[PDB]
Amino acid sequence: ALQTIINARLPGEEGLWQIHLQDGKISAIDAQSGVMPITENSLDAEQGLVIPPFVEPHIHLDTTQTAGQPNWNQSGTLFEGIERWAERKALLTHDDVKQRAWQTLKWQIANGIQHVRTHVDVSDATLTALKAMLEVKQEVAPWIDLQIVAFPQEGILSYPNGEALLEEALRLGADVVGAIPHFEFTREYGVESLHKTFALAQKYDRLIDVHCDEIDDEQSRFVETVAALAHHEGMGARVTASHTTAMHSYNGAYTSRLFRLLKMSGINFVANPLVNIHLQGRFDTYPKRRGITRVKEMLESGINVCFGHDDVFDPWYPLGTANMLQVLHMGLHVCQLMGYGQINDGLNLITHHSARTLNLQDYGIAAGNSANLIILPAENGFDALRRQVPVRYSVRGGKVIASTQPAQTTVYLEQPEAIDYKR
Template structure:
């Protein structure tokens, strides 16, 4: 049975893993289908407790749907009233396409009523007919909310035909919405209904980058039945993402850190992010020559600095070969 204390303990453990990996900004999706909103109330407490070290955004996520679940709409609004920062939806999981579209109209109205961001679990399915992302983009364009709206997963886009995708990308660019791909989990979960060949099921990251659409990588699940191998290390996410999205040019790899830093900050709608005069002294130091080196060697964060104070450090390890004479191996070229 889910308890307040259990939720907090699990969340704190995961946040400590994230902090140890240099993460200072987190967006978490909290299921608000529970009539008691146990997880949400626990996470709101966690948000306050970790505030000195991590900015935690909480998404009110209706895991079972908004219109397809008893009191789903009321529970979602109550979660927002209690303090959720972001409003979620899962249109492809609603009973019908019509319910899915209506659920999106409702969250846009709710976001404007309470001045909240939007992050939709959108088209996380291999069905090429799941096209709710066009509704998300159209509503964001209509309401001028693109910078505050995110479509997460959009794995169905992997299966769209070229003619439809071409038309869709025009709208996506005009809308200004953000995208999150989750390569560790998407590559594991998608394609399960396929025989062979099996699709990769990761959204069109490469094409979005080429089109100037903001896209970033997320970890999604960290250590659970959907993904049991996570350590909350975003360099692992980036490493996998560059592989499955076929971003293997030197420049693509070297600039890959943007997919887990500046692009992510834009998605989270962070203000005053980055190294500039007047910004908070929040930064991560990697013992690497450049982005390419950091990704290739998967270098742990040497220091994570928050408001000018070191909050996490990793002591460098050393590998020594004992051949004709001891020799240190750094894996550098």
């Protein structure tokens, strides 16, 4: 029965704020001139930062939690990962997918993530993972709004009945149409697959999220077709180009020309730091490229870009706890967004920009919006990122759905001293 969040700091705002709640929504937001006393029905942010929930714009819940089953990827390569996944085929069932997806979703709830977009491989005639994920979506709805992308992993034109299966996935309820041009047999199939993807999105009124140019090939430019088609249909807001790691290898002249179109099209971009730094640059000896898309330049140009985890504890990425501040930390380093303001503003890459990517209509600490917000025990984005703080409280519909009692560290010098890693 929470009525107020008090003593809240807000990004880009001075001072402390009080967030009033009513009927599961934010009724008003008022500045405070000092610290407010706690009381029944008040959740004290304790001068910590309050932001609208973290978002996971790109993850594969159908493959999550499978690392080491039955064997571990020892080389760490994409190739071996594919083989290790194949060895687990006998365990891939409806219940298995639901159990693993739920395990990661619980970690996400614990990490203040209330919006998740999962890709699901639909290059499977039985659509086993998709059927399982559609049930998971309904089951987790009280805690996470889950979007499902029908992802034609083996291609649309390069896989038997690929287009038919992609459309079947949409008819079953998938929220987003996926594609993977650079994986199609030819450049022509790649371009044609995008026309088919856009046609399906318009036919069913769905969003689009393409695994776009995820390859260190300076000639992989499917992103220009994604942006051009979006501009032509006037649907930029509903379109996302995931990865675009090839952009890391483009010459500057083409990239400059392309950026005009990217801005005009209004499409969204997702970079996946943890996985990109790991899987890109694998064909280089030395020097080795970083392989993340042009995040810094997109921000400078006002192009919406955000960060996803992509994989959690699977053959393609053995690590992760589904933590967005960890994803952000990696991205700030690899993209060299290390100035104070760049780091502080970093939270945008895992909150607001990701909400835009998911085309969310009810997101942000604003009057009238649902009371969905989280509290970080930190002074600002810089502090939260530097100390990799947990989510103190996650509030959804005005109710607490997760909480973390912080770790307590003590050093025993001449006298015991508490250490909080602040100066």
